């Protein structure tokens, strides 16, 4: 049971610093700039259409002492304002780069940016030779490289952190940074980008506009994931093509029985999750997985729910436990259900419902108490879930997410559920929707109620979400607007901002809380327990095996109040079992089934597919080893990919 | 100036009726059902996707004494819940028809509807043999006839007010009622409606599914407006086709020359918006003849939202021929334009009365669907009604970002010709009593307890504190009827975590105690863009005169604000004519001028398969304009004896 009253109020009251901002208009954004810099930026923005020239003044405040004091530096951005859609363009964590993209209050020949490379302590002003259509994008491999699309659909690039800009191509519809500062972009065949569905050209430049190469024609769309480049190509019908050499060579995606709607759910250096819409136009599709070449796919999960307008799904990478992914499917009776995989798409199981839930006490029927974990599918469906599932690799096994059972009331007002074993087991910890953040690599989790009333409570947990305490951080409740944490692995600082509205005018205020005094002592051996990740194959020899590697994790004991949450850790290999294999091309695991079985339609014919112009023949026991799985010994089904020395089809 | 003296708080306190609702979950909707019936329904709904089966219980409360008392009748809809997207399917006014379309808690073979034809005083339940994909639709000619699309894209029709249903066609994408119980609908050949865009077939049935007729192929979309049927056809580019004979014959829209949208259409005329070639967020409004075929330039640089295509186009239903929308000025300022002759001529909206004005823009922008789609803080579009002649209430902003972020509420009493800022900040508002009562409620994050009301058509406002426990505002609903005096406010308190819902019904009967006398009215004429005295009071060639309650009036009006007069027609002038095909009116200009690119070549268009030649002075009479005499410009459509 939880430890009642380790007194925190005194240690938090003296570490809570309020700042009132007078006469702020528009939306107010707050952000920490850097780890251990002390810098917090507060900026007001305005919702103004791009084409409209209007007058306005954004306000800008800066703290250099961790939120205790703010200096008005609006004079730096005199006679400009920033649109809410743009906000701040903050570079990578250790770069110190911040860019404010603004519009001149009276109008001008182009936009105006304010550039800082010292954690927002000094800005320089630069007039753009164009009006930005969207926010400027940093190159992932070089924060000095910026690209921006103009309102004239021109592609502009800067090599020196936005100081000097050059237009490298006109009539561009979409542009994206690839790897090693490559730029991919689409261009017109004629008039409008909207009217030219399926007739765009995909272009590549590897030297920031000096030379170009057309890598695709008749393009519907394109995207990037992991080491893979994807393009939807119009033949009257759409097919998916994959490239792992930045478009020099393409191969059509090979799916058993490339369709009208596709989506890359996730992709890394090892594999691809691909969603393909079911024939006709229903609310569900199918998840396919590929090898590290991104070409040959196999059926992974049926009836995967997606929003027909936008393609969002509940697909969630559980980043706090290797190999774990969660998403939502439509059961046979059209109930929503959360499925979870612990082997990177090889096998999926129903998410387990909490034991002895309040739902179990009132449910007049089973399956009513199934737990649906809310993500982008719920959010796009306009449900009241203010945050997707939250996890981070440093906080091993911790997942925080909104969830609902099979009641309309629960769907309307989700609750916050906590998992400490990467999603295998869940407990309802907070009533109603919340905003939440992880600090101190999981040593501190904080949540704030999301409702119509003004709030004055911080809820926090120091034992990975098992026990919660409430801290009244003000006597004047605020309509909550934002929650922002200082970055860093050992973070203790968090800022809340919002406003009072006793009459018609909003008075904005920020509260910065330092949790330094709460976690005084360092955890010892009796403060932890040990746990092994869940395995779907039975046997003590298979407990704790993740993709062929057995490992052991710690977990803070319930009611713990201590720091030094050691990094959860000698590697050992497991024997091979079914959980270490995906189904092969043409095979699948029926719902609730452990073994792969050949899809019925292919039972008659030989399994063949196209691989870079060469037709291949597949003989298989129905299995192929999961990319990245270091399994050895045990079960080893056989497969052979024989080249037929023939052109495709 | 306003008369603050008549103390109203005593006359309103005894006429304010509170009802507290226990354990309401989900979204809460409230609606009056019928003129002088006394019926108010309160229903809880849930935001749940269509395909998902879940458990839930909607709650249903009914008042039969004008909101003083509510009876829990949830048992009527036991074991069902209603989706927020569906709500209630309310038949036409005075029909008495209400239908609650629900799904069964836990799933079933089809939906379940609860049907009433006596203003929701008695319901009967019917199990549907299908799951409805969208809300059921009443036939405008017969409220017993219903239409519904199933989640399997089957087309279902009922002839007996939803008691018995028949499936008349499968694989249907969209279906709509025509004028005489005709049904137009599109169907694909195989697969998906999304994938078969531009390859759909447009079908018609005039006998509720007994027989069908294919009236269009290669269809992208279709729609109905006024007496016009529209279809978008995929050729290499998409173009719009019009039919005035229910699809037996079509004609392509003839524009002097891209994406096409129908802004509005009635029995006389079509408003068409045409997107610029490069998609820069603005387009051009074109107007048609009475056939919907021949179009001419009406308004340039018409702003539209780049994704949904919404514009600020607003029909001022309280004054004939008046429309307002937003355009992009030469320096990319937003501006409101107004027409008093149904698109013939547009003028800049006049600056608000009594204002202190720097920049070039103290101009007043009236907020509508373009502002709403641009995510501005505008909770309601402009509000007007035909019975409340000349009254328009709308959100407006001047040309500073602060004003755009927090618009104010403006009042016009002459159909939008002149405007005054009457309320600070965004509000919800409603008109009842044919304009005798206007009510407004603040839109903000804090709970409210004040009702703002006007009894002189918006010229003077008073504040009434209707409760000591402020509520987070949810809705404002007025009793229907020309002489209505009751409104309902509902919302919830949330002192802790739980919402407690409550309704407040206010009766203005004691406020408007005495009846207005002759000294309570003034008379006015609608604005005319031609300055002659022979055109005073002329609206589209027809003379009329209006009344208006004097400022600070607190009395009940029983007269139609249109004075009863023998009808008289006006002489023709420029305001009575559109520009002809190939002509347009420059900004602020009264006379039409030929578009420059066409000044050299012969004006030609295709009309019913035959190529036609147009010689014109630049004008054509506005469709519906009852003008006679006066100006008579010449035009001739000469057949060229050629196919097209
Ligand atoms: C789902 O989220 C997890 C966690 O973020 C992703 O896993 C991580 O992916 C990165 C890059 O692929 C891995 O980095 C690698 O780092 C190691 C060690 O420095 C290096 O030897 C490799 O060459 C590689 O650069 C990282 O280790 C890995 N972390 C874990 C816990 O697996 C995963 O990629 C996501 N899934 C998908 C499909 O994207
Ligand atoms: C969380 O926020 C707190 C502030 O509320 C941070 O603590 C502050 O850190 C600064 C910089 O390390 C400390 O300043 C230093 O003082 C020494 C002399 O003692 C001086 O040489 C340095 O130049 C600097 O001024 C400051 O004292 C300290 N304030 C408090 C109240 O502890 C803290 O670093 C933040 N991060 C974490 C992880 O807690
Ligand atoms: C995987 O396992 C689950 C059980 O854990 C299987 O679920 C079952 O699904 C059927 C529907 O396919 C449920 O059935 C019946 O539905 C009818 C409606 O037509 C209803 O009238 C009956 O009362 C009944 O509920 C059944 O209840 C359910 N079983 C359980 C224990 O929940 C699922 O089908 C399996 N998947 C595969 C591919 O085999
Ligand atoms: C606004 O709401 C009030 C109630 O707050 C409505 O007043 C009520 O209307 C009915 C019908 O006129 C009245 O009831 C009965 O009328 C019959 C005559 O058919 C009579 O014999 C009964 O004795 C009874 O009065 C009811 O008394 C009346 N007023 C009140 C205060 O209860 C009113 O009709 C609503 N609408 C308008 C436009 O004011
Ligand atoms: C714009 O609003 C007005 C007011 O509703 C419409 O005018 C009426 O049209 C109906 C149906 O044709 C007639 O029955 C009424 O007699 C008209 N009333 C008035 C005051 O004109 C008008 O048709 C609407 N739509 C368009 C496209 O203008
Ligand atoms: C910029 O702001 C200053 C206030 O410091 C103001 O006086 C000045 O007019 C502005 N400059 C321009 C060019 O508008
Ligand atoms: C509501 O419906 C359920 C299922 O039909 C039934 O068991 C229950 O008795 C009903 N409640 C009432 C009050 O009739
Ligand atoms: C058009 O008329 C308005 C109102 O009289 C005037 O203010 C404006 O300057 C005119 N516009 C142009 C472009 O001349
Ligand atoms: Na870098
Ligand atoms: Na951009
Ligand atoms: Na009445
Ligand atoms: Na049902
Ligand atoms: Na009809």
Coordinates of N, CA, C and O in Angstrom, one line a residue, chain A residues 272-374:
Chain A
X272 N 9.8 -2.3 -41.6 CA 8.7 -1.3 -42.0 C 7.4 -1.9 -41.4 O 7.1 -3.1 -41.6
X273 N 6.6 -1.0 -40.8 CA 5.2 -1.3 -40.5 C 4.4 -0.5 -41.5 O 4.5 0.7 -41.6
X274 N 3.6 -1.2 -42.3 CA 2.8 -0.6 -43.4 C 1.3 -1.0 -43.2 O 1.0 -2.1 -43.0
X275 N 0.5 0.1 -43.2 CA -1.0 -0.1 -43.1 C -1.6 0.0 -44.5 O -1.2 1.0 -45.3
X276 N -2.4 -0.9 -44.9 CA -3.1 -0.9 -46.2 C -4.6 -1.0 -46.1 O -5.1 -1.9 -45.4
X277 N -5.3 -0.1 -46.7 CA -6.8 -0.1 -46.5 C -7.4 -1.3 -47.1 O -7.1 -1.7 -48.2
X278 N -8.4 -1.8 -46.4 CA -9.2 -3.0 -46.9 C -10.0 -2.6 -48.2 O -10.2 -1.4 -48.4
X279 N -10.3 -3.6 -49.1 CA -11.0 -3.2 -50.3 C -12.3 -2.5 -50.0 O -12.9 -2.6 -48.9
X280 N -12.9 -1.8 -51.0 CA -14.0 -1.0 -50.6 C -13.5 0.2 -49.8 O -12.4 0.7 -50.1
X281 N -14.3 0.7 -48.9 CA -13.9 1.8 -48.1 C -14.5 1.7 -46.7 O -15.6 2.3 -46.4
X282 N -14.0 0.9 -45.8 CA -14.4 0.7 -44.5 C -13.4 1.3 -43.5 O -12.4 1.8 -43.9
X283 N -13.8 1.3 -42.2 CA -12.9 1.9 -41.2 C -11.7 1.1 -40.8 O -11.1 1.5 -39.8
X284 N -11.3 0.0 -41.4 CA -10.2 -0.7 -41.0 C -9.4 -1.2 -42.2 O -9.8 -1.2 -43.3
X285 N -8.1 -1.5 -41.9 CA -7.2 -2.0 -42.9 C -6.3 -3.2 -42.3 O -6.7 -3.8 -41.4
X286 N -5.1 -3.4 -42.9 CA -4.2 -4.5 -42.5 C -2.8 -3.9 -42.3 O -2.3 -3.2 -43.2
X287 N -2.2 -4.4 -41.2 CA -0.8 -4.0 -41.0 C 0.1 -5.1 -41.6 O -0.1 -6.3 -41.3
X288 N 1.1 -4.7 -42.4 CA 2.1 -5.6 -43.0 C 3.5 -5.2 -42.5 O 3.7 -4.0 -42.2
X289 N 4.3 -6.1 -42.4 CA 5.7 -5.9 -42.0 C 6.7 -6.4 -43.1 O 6.4 -7.4 -43.7
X290 N 7.8 -5.7 -43.2 CA 8.8 -6.1 -44.2 C 10.1 -6.4 -43.5 O 10.3 -6.2 -42.3
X291 N 11.1 -7.0 -44.3 CA 12.4 -7.1 -43.8 C 13.2 -5.8 -43.9 O 12.6 -4.8 -44.2
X292 N 14.5 -5.8 -43.8 CA 15.3 -4.6 -43.8 C 15.4 -4.0 -45.2 O 16.0 -2.9 -45.4
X293 N 14.9 -4.7 -46.2 CA 14.9 -4.2 -47.6 C 13.6 -3.4 -47.9 O 13.6 -2.7 -48.9
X294 N 12.6 -3.5 -47.1 CA 11.3 -2.8 -47.3 C 10.5 -3.3 -48.5 O 9.6 -2.6 -48.9
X295 N 10.8 -4.4 -49.1 CA 10.2 -4.9 -50.3 C 9.1 -6.0 -50.1 O 8.0 -5.9 -50.6
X296 N 9.5 -7.0 -49.4 CA 8.7 -8.2 -49.2 C 8.0 -8.1 -47.9 O 8.6 -8.0 -46.8
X297 N 6.6 -8.1 -48.0 CA 5.8 -7.9 -46.8 C 5.0 -9.2 -46.5 O 4.8 -10.0 -47.3
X298 N 4.6 -9.3 -45.2 CA 3.8 -10.4 -44.7 C 2.7 -9.8 -43.8 O 2.9 -8.8 -43.1
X299 N 1.5 -10.5 -43.8 CA 0.4 -10.0 -43.0 C 0.7 -10.1 -41.5 O 1.2 -11.1 -41.0
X300 N 0.5 -9.0 -40.8 CA 0.8 -8.9 -39.4 C -0.4 -8.8 -38.5 O -0.5 -9.4 -37.4
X301 N -1.3 -7.9 -38.8 CA -2.5 -7.7 -38.0 C -3.7 -7.3 -38.9 O -3.6 -6.3 -39.7
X302 N -4.8 -7.9 -38.7 CA -6.0 -7.6 -39.5 C -6.9 -6.6 -38.7 O -6.9 -6.4 -37.5
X303 N -7.8 -6.0 -39.5 CA -8.8 -5.1 -39.0 C -8.3 -3.9 -38.2 O -8.8 -3.6 -37.2
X304 N -7.2 -3.3 -38.7 CA -6.5 -2.2 -38.0 C -7.3 -0.9 -38.3 O -7.5 -0.5 -39.5
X305 N -7.8 -0.3 -37.2 CA -8.7 0.9 -37.4 C -7.9 2.1 -37.9 O -6.8 2.3 -37.4
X306 N -8.5 2.9 -38.7 CA -8.0 4.1 -39.2 C -9.1 5.1 -39.5 O -10.2 4.8 -39.9
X307 N -8.7 6.4 -39.4 CA -9.7 7.5 -39.7 C -9.7 7.7 -41.2 O -8.7 8.0 -41.8
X308 N -10.9 7.6 -41.8 CA -11.0 7.7 -43.2 C -10.5 9.0 -43.8 O -10.1 9.1 -44.9
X309 N -10.7 10.1 -42.9 CA -10.3 11.5 -43.3 C -9.0 11.8 -42.6 O -9.0 12.4 -41.5
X310 N -7.8 11.5 -43.2 CA -6.5 11.7 -42.6 C -5.7 10.5 -42.4 O -4.4 10.7 -42.3
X311 N -6.3 9.3 -42.3 CA -5.5 8.1 -42.1 C -4.8 7.9 -40.8 O -3.9 7.0 -40.7
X312 N -5.2 8.6 -39.7 CA -4.6 8.3 -38.4 C -5.1 7.0 -37.9 O -6.2 6.5 -38.1
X313 N -4.2 6.4 -37.1 CA -4.4 5.1 -36.4 C -4.0 5.2 -35.0 O -3.3 6.2 -34.6
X314 N -4.3 4.2 -34.2 CA -3.8 4.2 -32.8 C -2.4 3.6 -32.6 O -2.0 3.4 -31.5
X315 N -1.7 3.4 -33.7 CA -0.4 2.7 -33.7 C 0.5 3.5 -32.8 O 0.8 4.7 -33.0
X316 N 1.0 2.8 -31.8 CA 1.9 3.4 -30.7 C 3.1 2.6 -30.5 O 3.0 1.4 -30.2
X317 N 4.3 3.2 -30.8 CA 5.6 2.6 -30.4 C 5.8 2.8 -28.9 O 5.9 3.9 -28.4
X318 N 5.8 1.7 -28.1 CA 6.1 1.7 -26.7 C 7.6 1.9 -26.6 O 8.3 0.8 -26.4
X319 N 8.1 3.1 -26.6 CA 9.5 3.3 -26.7 C 10.3 3.0 -25.4 O 11.5 3.0 -25.4
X320 N 9.5 2.6 -24.3 CA 10.2 2.3 -23.0 C 10.4 0.8 -22.9 O 10.9 0.4 -21.8
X321 N 10.2 0.0 -23.9 CA 10.4 -1.4 -23.9 C 10.6 -1.9 -25.3 O 9.7 -1.7 -26.1
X322 N 11.8 -2.5 -25.5 CA 12.1 -2.9 -26.9 C 11.1 -3.9 -27.5 O 10.7 -4.9 -26.8
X323 N 10.7 -3.7 -28.7 CA 9.9 -4.6 -29.4 C 8.4 -4.5 -29.2 O 7.6 -5.3 -29.7
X324 N 7.9 -3.5 -28.4 CA 6.5 -3.4 -27.9 C 5.8 -2.4 -28.7 O 6.3 -1.2 -28.8
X325 N 4.7 -2.7 -29.3 CA 3.8 -1.8 -30.0 C 2.4 -2.0 -29.7 O 2.0 -3.2 -29.5
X326 N 1.6 -1.0 -29.6 CA 0.2 -1.0 -29.3 C -0.6 -0.3 -30.4 O -0.2 0.7 -30.9
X327 N -1.8 -0.9 -30.7 CA -2.7 -0.2 -31.6 C -4.1 -0.8 -31.4 O -4.3 -1.6 -30.5
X328 N -5.1 -0.2 -32.1 CA -6.5 -0.6 -32.0 C -7.0 -1.3 -33.2 O -6.7 -1.0 -34.3
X329 N -7.8 -2.3 -33.0 CA -8.5 -3.1 -34.0 C -10.0 -3.2 -33.8 O -10.5 -2.9 -32.7
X330 N -10.7 -3.6 -34.8 CA -12.1 -3.8 -34.8 C -12.3 -5.3 -34.6 O -12.0 -6.1 -35.5
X331 N -12.9 -5.8 -33.5 CA -13.2 -7.2 -33.3 C -14.3 -7.6 -34.3 O -14.8 -6.9 -35.1
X332 N -14.6 -8.9 -34.2 CA -15.6 -9.5 -35.1 C -17.0 -8.9 -34.8 O -17.8 -8.8 -35.8
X333 N -17.3 -8.5 -33.6 CA -18.6 -7.9 -33.3 C -18.5 -6.3 -33.4 O -19.4 -5.7 -32.8
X334 N -17.5 -5.8 -34.0 CA -17.3 -4.4 -34.2 C -17.1 -3.6 -32.9 O -17.5 -2.5 -32.7
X335 N -16.6 -4.3 -31.9 CA -16.0 -3.7 -30.7 C -14.6 -3.2 -31.0 O -13.8 -3.9 -31.7
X336 N -14.3 -2.1 -30.4 CA -12.9 -1.6 -30.5 C -12.1 -2.4 -29.4 O -12.6 -2.7 -28.3
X337 N -10.9 -2.7 -29.7 CA -10.0 -3.4 -28.8 C -8.6 -3.0 -29.0 O -8.2 -2.7 -30.2
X338 N -7.8 -2.9 -27.9 CA -6.4 -2.6 -28.0 C -5.6 -3.9 -28.2 O -5.8 -4.9 -27.4
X339 N -4.7 -4.0 -29.1 CA -3.8 -5.2 -29.3 C -2.4 -4.7 -29.0 O -2.0 -3.6 -29.2
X340 N -1.6 -5.7 -28.6 CA -0.2 -5.4 -28.2 C 0.7 -6.5 -28.7 O 0.3 -7.7 -28.7
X341 N 1.8 -6.1 -29.2 CA 2.9 -7.1 -29.7 C 4.1 -6.8 -28.8 O 4.5 -5.7 -28.5
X342 N 4.8 -7.9 -28.4 CA 6.0 -7.9 -27.7 C 7.2 -8.3 -28.6 O 8.3 -8.4 -28.1
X343 N 6.9 -8.7 -29.9 CA 8.0 -9.2 -30.8 C 7.9 -8.5 -32.1 O 8.0 -9.1 -33.2
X344 N 7.7 -7.2 -32.1 CA 7.9 -6.3 -33.2 C 6.9 -6.7 -34.4 O 7.4 -6.7 -35.6
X345 N 5.7 -7.1 -34.1 CA 4.7 -7.4 -35.1 C 4.6 -8.9 -35.5 O 3.7 -9.2 -36.2
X346 N 5.5 -9.7 -34.9 CA 5.3 -11.1 -35.2 C 4.0 -11.7 -34.7 O 3.3 -12.3 -35.5
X347 N 3.6 -11.4 -33.5 CA 2.4 -11.9 -32.9 C 1.7 -10.8 -32.1 O 2.4 -10.1 -31.4
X348 N 0.4 -10.6 -32.2 CA -0.3 -9.7 -31.5 C -1.3 -10.4 -30.5 O -1.9 -11.4 -30.9
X349 N -1.5 -9.8 -29.4 CA -2.5 -10.3 -28.4 C -3.4 -9.2 -27.9 O -3.0 -8.0 -28.0
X350 N -4.5 -9.6 -27.4 CA -5.4 -8.6 -26.8 C -4.7 -7.9 -25.5 O -4.1 -8.6 -24.7
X351 N -4.9 -6.6 -25.5 CA -4.4 -5.9 -24.3 C -5.2 -6.4 -23.1 O -6.4 -6.5 -23.1
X352 N -4.4 -6.7 -22.0 CA -5.1 -7.2 -20.8 C -5.8 -6.1 -20.0 O -5.3 -5.0 -19.8
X353 N -7.0 -6.4 -19.6 CA -7.8 -5.4 -18.8 C -7.3 -5.5 -17.3 O -6.8 -6.5 -16.8
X354 N -7.4 -4.4 -16.6 CA -7.0 -4.4 -15.2 C -7.8 -5.3 -14.4 O -9.0 -5.6 -14.7
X355 N -7.2 -5.9 -13.3 CA -7.9 -6.8 -12.5 C -8.8 -6.1 -11.5 O -8.5 -5.1 -10.9
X356 N -10.0 -6.6 -11.3 CA -11.0 -6.1 -10.4 C -11.3 -4.6 -10.6 O -11.2 -3.8 -9.7
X357 N -11.5 -4.2 -11.8 CA -11.8 -2.8 -12.1 C -13.1 -2.4 -11.6 O -14.0 -3.3 -11.3
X358 N -13.4 -1.1 -11.5 CA -14.7 -0.6 -11.1 C -15.7 -1.0 -12.2 O -16.9 -1.3 -11.9
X359 N -15.2 -1.2 -13.5 CA -16.1 -1.6 -14.5 C -16.6 -3.1 -14.3 O -17.7 -3.4 -14.5
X360 N -15.7 -3.9 -13.8 CA -16.0 -5.3 -13.5 C -17.1 -5.4 -12.4 O -17.9 -6.4 -12.4
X361 N -17.2 -4.4 -11.6 CA -18.3 -4.4 -10.5 C -19.7 -4.0 -11.1 O -20.7 -4.4 -10.5
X362 N -19.7 -3.3 -12.2 CA -21.0 -2.8 -12.7 C -21.3 -3.4 -14.1 O -22.4 -3.2 -14.6
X363 N -20.4 -4.1 -14.7 CA -20.6 -4.6 -16.1 C -21.7 -5.7 -16.1 O -21.5 -6.7 -15.4
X364 N -22.7 -5.5 -16.8 CA -23.8 -6.5 -17.0 C -23.4 -7.4 -18.2 O -24.2 -8.2 -18.6
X365 N -22.1 -7.4 -18.7 CA -21.7 -8.2 -19.8 C -20.2 -8.1 -19.9 O -19.6 -7.1 -19.5
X366 N -19.6 -9.2 -20.2 CA -18.1 -9.3 -20.5 C -17.8 -8.5 -21.8 O -18.7 -8.0 -22.5
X367 N -16.5 -8.3 -22.1 CA -16.0 -7.6 -23.2 C -16.4 -6.1 -23.0 O -15.8 -5.2 -23.7
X368 N -17.3 -5.8 -22.2 CA -17.6 -4.4 -21.9 C -16.5 -3.7 -21.1 O -16.3 -2.5 -21.3
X369 N -15.7 -4.5 -20.4 CA -14.6 -3.9 -19.6 C -13.3 -4.0 -20.3 O -12.2 -3.8 -19.6
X370 N -13.2 -4.3 -21.6 CA -12.0 -4.2 -22.3 C -11.4 -2.8 -22.3 O -12.1 -1.8 -22.3
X371 N -10.1 -2.8 -22.2 CA -9.4 -1.5 -22.1 C -8.9 -1.1 -23.5 O -8.0 -1.8 -24.1
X372 N -9.3 0.1 -23.9 CA -8.9 0.7 -25.1 C -7.9 1.8 -24.8 O -8.3 2.8 -24.1
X373 N -6.7 1.7 -25.3 CA -5.7 2.7 -25.1 C -5.8 3.8 -26.2 O -5.7 3.4 -27.4
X374 N -6.0 5.0 -25.8 CA -6.3 6.1 -26.8 C -5.0 6.6 -27.4 O -4.0 6.9 -26.7

